[PDB]
Amino acid sequence: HKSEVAHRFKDLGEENFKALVLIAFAQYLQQCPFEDHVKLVNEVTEFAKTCVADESAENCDKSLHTLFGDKLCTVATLRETYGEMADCCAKQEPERNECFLQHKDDNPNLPRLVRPEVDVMCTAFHDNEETFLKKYLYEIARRHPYFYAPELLFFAKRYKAAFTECCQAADKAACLLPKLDELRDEGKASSAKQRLKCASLQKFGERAFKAWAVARLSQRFPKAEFAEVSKLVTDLTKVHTECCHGDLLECADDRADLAKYICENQDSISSKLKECCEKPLLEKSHCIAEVENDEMPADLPSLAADFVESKDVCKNYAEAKDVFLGMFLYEYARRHPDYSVVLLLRLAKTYETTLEKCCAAADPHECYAKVFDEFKPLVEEPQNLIKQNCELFEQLGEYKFQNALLVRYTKKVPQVSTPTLVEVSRNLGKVGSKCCKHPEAKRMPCAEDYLSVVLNQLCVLHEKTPVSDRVTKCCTESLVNRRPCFSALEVDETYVPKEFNAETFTFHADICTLSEKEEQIKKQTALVELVKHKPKATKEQLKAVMDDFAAFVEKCCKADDKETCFAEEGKKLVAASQAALG
Ligand SMILES: CN(C)c1cccc2c(S(=O)(=O)N[C@@H](CCCNC(=N)N)C(=O)O)cccc12
Ligand SMILES: CN(C)c1cccc2c(S(=O)(=O)N[C@@H](CCCNC(=N)N)C(=O)O)cccc12
Ligand SMILES: CCCCCCCCCCCCCC(=O)O
Ligand SMILES: CCCCCCCCCCCCCC(=O)O
């Protein structure tokens, strides 16, 4: 109303307000120390309480961007510490805010945040819960200037919970550690997905984004009408554009509106928004965005009616190509919550191509009549890979399943670095253990979501150090063809094996004391290097060495004079193996 800070203060609450202001400042002034930001927060909070009291008090009328900018320009060491950015303070709003956005460092040169010992961690938490959580909130926020603030706040509260439950536990570590690792990945995944959607919106444009949304929104709100889905898709697009531009406030307002709009028309969108809509202003958005798919209508016509038979296909299609295709997408997506969004896009793409070729032919109907048949092979491809890979994972464990993927890809792309291969394969394996446990109907969507992030990470590392044209093709290809492209890679015939290296296969007793995580990465690293040396080795030849090795270790780690065993038997292993693998 009259006062913006007052309004936000009232909605959000004191605690949330103070946390968000902190995150916001940490995201711009990434270089200032924790104690400086805390001061800022206090002053902004105090000022806020002043306005809550008297809406007409000094400055309370000024907009949030203006207020935020002024306080930002208050920092005396602004130029000394941030140089160029200080020139932003000379500009008027909105150039000022705009200027600040352009100077936000997407990834500064800060030190990796290390995880302390669980005990020091639980004691710090206990002795000063607030400064312990806020300082870490600060460290995370400054390292991820683009992470949507409210969401970072959502994570914080889960972290708080993990410490309460675990620092009380008998075995604190057994409780805490795994919850922490889970929190980290979930954080890594959210981060990666946010930057991924933004990248895509930049490269492939609005249209492509819109398409992806119709599909996703349709699977989620199958009982909504195409007109509502269009509405939502338009607003969602605006939201992402702005949220991607990086302006927290604008992004927040857009999201608030959309969430409240959805809740008001809740009855005509989805029957699973009841809970989400009764939640606090700060959680509405987050909830809705993650809502389970609603139940789809039972009395739903067959597609071929309006899209294959009907002689108005080309008529309706030429009258508004994108709308018609959007309708096709809507119709197909809502009957298939079990398809990955990108699979749906491939079908829509296929349908479009057909109509382009066909509607330009004498007898349209005859030309495009056998299209739903062209879909079959498209749908089955992803399904087959799922059942096939999920079975294999059920046999061997995650670990053993990770090794198979290790051999499989080292062969396809031997140029890639051994460490990169180990990491990608490990994360790929995890997708197997996180998705294969769901009933079929949810597998593909799961794989898509986890595969998309892992594939982007893969492409990035490669952007930096290009090592293969094939990998770069897949990486730059259509986002809808990214995964298929990687799936179509075959063994590298050209590759010339790395010259043998003794050190690379020498193992010491230190291997017996390392943690599982460590031992595995140690073994998996030799494996990639093994394959990189003998790429023509068969499943049989390999399993042989591995079995020998397997024993080797266990044997030399349960016998006196370790380092002797590994050195004496080690020579034997390598000697025999070099021979078996000719
Ligand atoms: C919940 N969310 C916001 C996160 C919590 C903790 C760590 C996160 C990280 S992380 O990078 O610190 N943690 C990962 C990635 C290593 C990258 N390190 C860099 N210095 N770049 C890790 O420790 O294996 C990234 C993204 C989100 C995170
Ligand atoms: C709450 N309003 C404003 C929404 C915001 C963002 C995404 C929404 C979606 S969605 O389908 O795009 N939801 C996305 C994930 C949301 C982003 N989540 C993050 N943690 N970053 C998806 O399922 O692929 C559906 C409905 C409402 C949404
Ligand atoms: C009005 C609704 C807009 C939806 C537009 C339908 C376009 C679907 C065709 C599929 C295109 C695949 C996406 C791409 O890679 O370009
Ligand atoms: C030509 C040198 C061959 C010797 C190298 C042996 C390295 C193989 C690594 C074994 C990894 C199998 C994983 C496991 O033991 O569970």
Curated annotation (Swiss-Prot):
Positions annotated as glycosylated: 10, 49, 135, 160, 197, 223, 231, 274, 279, 311, 315-316, 321, 349, 376, 411, 437, 442, 492, 523, 532, 534, 543, 571
The reported result of mutating residue 558 to E is:
In Church bay
Outcome when changing residue 311 to N: In Canterbury/New Guinea/Tagliacozzo/Cuneo/Cooperstown
Q: What is the effect of changing residue 65 to A?
A: Impairs metal binding
User: Binding residues for (4Z,15Z)-bilirubin IXalpha, per the UniProt record?
Assistant: 238
Residues noted as binding Ca(2+) 2 in the record, renumbered to the chain? 11, 253, 257
Q: Where does Ca(2+) 1 bind?
A: 4, 242, 247, 250
What positions are modified (Phosphoserine)? Answer: 3, 56, 63, 271, 417, 487
Q: Which PROSITE patterns match?
A: ALBUMIN_1 (PS00212), ALBUMIN_2 (PS51438)
Q: Provide the residue positions that the database annotates as binding Cu cation.
A: 1
- Outcome of substituting residue 175 to F: In Hawkes bay
Disease per record is: Hyperthyroxinemia, familial dysalbuminemic: A disorder characterized by abnormally elevated levels of total serum thyroxine (T4) in euthyroid patients. It is due to abnormal serum albumin that binds T4 with enhanced affinity. Analbuminemia: A rare autosomal recessive disorder manifested by the presence of a very low amount of circulating serum albumin. Affected individuals manifest mild edema, hypotension, fatigue, and, occasionally, lower body lipodystrophy (mainly in adult females). The most common biochemical finding is hyperlipidemia, with a significant increase in the total and LDL cholesterol concentrations, but normal concentrations of HDL cholesterol and triglycerides.
Question: This chain belongs to which protein, by name?
Answer: Albumin
